[PDB]
Amino acid sequence: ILPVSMTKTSVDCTMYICGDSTECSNLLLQYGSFCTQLKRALTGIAVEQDKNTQEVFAQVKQIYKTPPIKYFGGFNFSQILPDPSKPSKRSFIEDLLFNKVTLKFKGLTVLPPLLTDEMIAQYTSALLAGTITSGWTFGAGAALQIPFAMQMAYRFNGIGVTQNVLYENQKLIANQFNSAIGKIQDSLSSTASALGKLQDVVNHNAQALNTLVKQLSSKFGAISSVLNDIFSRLDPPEAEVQIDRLITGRLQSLQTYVTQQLIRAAEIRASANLAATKMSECVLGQSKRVDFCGKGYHLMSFPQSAPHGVVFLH
Amino acid sequence: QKLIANQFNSAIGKIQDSLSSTASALGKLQDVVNHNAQALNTLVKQLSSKFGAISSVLNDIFSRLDPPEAEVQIDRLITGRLQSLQTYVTQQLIRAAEIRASANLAATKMSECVLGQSKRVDFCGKGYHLMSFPQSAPHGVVFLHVTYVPAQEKNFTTAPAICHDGKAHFPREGVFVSNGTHWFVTQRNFYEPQIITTDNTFVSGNCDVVIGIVNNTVYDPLQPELD
Amino acid sequence: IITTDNTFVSGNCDVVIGIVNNTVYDPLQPELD
Amino acid sequence: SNVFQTRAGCLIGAEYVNNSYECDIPIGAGICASYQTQSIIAYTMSLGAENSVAYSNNSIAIPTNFTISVTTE
Asked: Taken in order D54, B130, B115, D71, is the CA torsion positive or negative?
């Protein structure tokens, strides 16, 4: 489970301060326009997660199309490939994951993901199709066709298994594969912690969000942290400068919040480079890496989406 | 040798045509500089930023207000300029770690791209990797990644097994093909006629598992020597 | 030693530049099989 | 001009086309833009050419050529 995106959040300046009160804007501009560069950094952030999605999901040349009939001359792949029968074209595992993971906010915005859930779903489907039908080459241009029995004979020679163990006994290894997949799906449905690293980040975000929410009452020296309370029971002469110190305080707060946001974004960035490297190696061939696509003499990996990340079934 | 060398020459021409036509493709290399300057800009902007003070410069407030009514304000000025600096340097560190990882990556690039060839499929440039040639930059590096991308795929006929005298045979390295009135053996990843000896087939199992397969004769490479 | 086993043939000896002519012996001959 | 409504919100000043084109300026929530040549069209981001690769069993398609391409990292 690799957190690959993050909620591309953003913060409006005046919507965060008070709304449309004019003393807010005048004290702001007298202080300065820091929130300009703050939201500059955040918009940056957002576009890096956009690029993370692009560089993790859609490295392929074009959107290789799967046949809806998951039949490849003796193989059934509806368990792994999506079937069009659902209103959403998603593989069963991805739907189990999205339902299994439970996911305009008063001054803070959650910009929508550019690559929509269905769109990232078609990326996943297409790259799955490339990996299975066309094989390892699909990341270097056209996804060249080649017969899967030959692909599997070649794979077994990769791990040093001859071709008679397959063309006579495809079924044993395939059934072990599918049964293990079934055990996986059972775990995923039943174990809510097996995907922790994908909602904790949201929790992080949430708590970070909560942090800025929580700070909204922190006062920093004077009596009342509500702008309207000061503007009401304090006369405008002093209310100006009291609102000014509050501006100072939550400016510090938002800066600190977005600094944690940047650092979390750096973590996301490392993880997303990780995800892209997995999406290359683990996906585009029998990966030589031994403990990078999962433990052991790694064979391959199948990705599925998540509300903000990816899941590689190694 | 010669024709691939010439196609590399064509790749060279593509290199120059792209680079002359792409002088701005250094965006990913140049943006950071702006950020630095931008960060610098920001710090300069905060020289003008009051941070709650009646002004943002030391000299004017010192000259206007004699110290006995200005020491505390001077000290707050000091603290605000400080906190600006620590914040700025904090983003400096964040980006510092960013480029830190980036150039760890870069050293890896030159190791597995310059000092060697990376088996990794999307690490040294797009797709299959041959080589990489570095170049300097005002603050970074450029890798001309020289990579492989196939094309022109056309259909021919292969076989999964050969039932020779009831014995299942499977290709060692290469596949059967037929170009017209003739059948030969080529390689798996590309097309080339090759020497047809016993070397291209190995026995594992029988041909009774797949019903109706054809029966074939594999000549001994020593019988023509025997006669 | 350059023998039939440890070498391959792909195209005639016109694609190599400045080629030289030499004799390479087939390993089957000493066995006389 | 014409006003379109997408999951990201309300796109005005864009003549929402339904046609498939490669994406240049991603507009949001899965929709991108292009230049009509005149006016600026917005559409559902044409995902790509759905290359339905042909699975094969007992015949192959050899890549008879290639390109030694060069990229700038």
From this structure: negative
Chains D and B touch (3+ CB pairs under 8 A): yes
Task: Determine the residue type at B153.
Answer: E
Whose CA is closest to D32, among B195, A114, A38, A281?
A114
* Closest partner CB to C10 (pick from B1, B192, B221): B192
Chain A residues with CB under 8 Å of B126 CB are 139-140
CA distance A250 to chain B (A): 12
Q: Which tokens in the block code for residue B134? A: 């570095």
Task: Assess whether chains A and D touch, using the rule of 3 or more C-beta pairs within 8 angstroms.
Answer: yes
**Expt. technique:** cryo-EM
- Are the beta carbons of A3 and A53 closer than 8 angstroms? no
Contact call for residues A114 and D28 (beta carbons, < 8 A): yes
> DSSP string of A161-202?
--SHHHHTTHHHHHHHHHHHHHHHHHHHHH-SSTTHHHHHHH
Task: Tell me, yes or no, if A117 comes closer than 8 A to chain D by beta carbon.
Answer: no
Q: Which residue does chain D place closest to A71, by CA atoms?
A: D55
Q: Which DSSP string corresponds to B13-42?
A: HHHHHHHHH-SSTTHHHHHHHHHHHHHHHH
Resolution to one decimal, Å: 4.3
Q: Do B159 and D60 touch (CB under 8 A)?
A: no
Please name the member of D59, D68, D69 whose beta carbon is closest to the beta carbon of B157: D59
Alpha-carbon span B49 to B83, nearest angstrom = 12
Question: In a 3-state reduction of DSSP, which class is residue A229?
Answer: helix
Of A208, A9, A22, the closest CA to residue A105 belongs to: A9
Q: Which two tokens stand for residue B51?
A: 């941070």
> A59: which chain B residues are within 8 Å (Cβ-Cβ)?
122
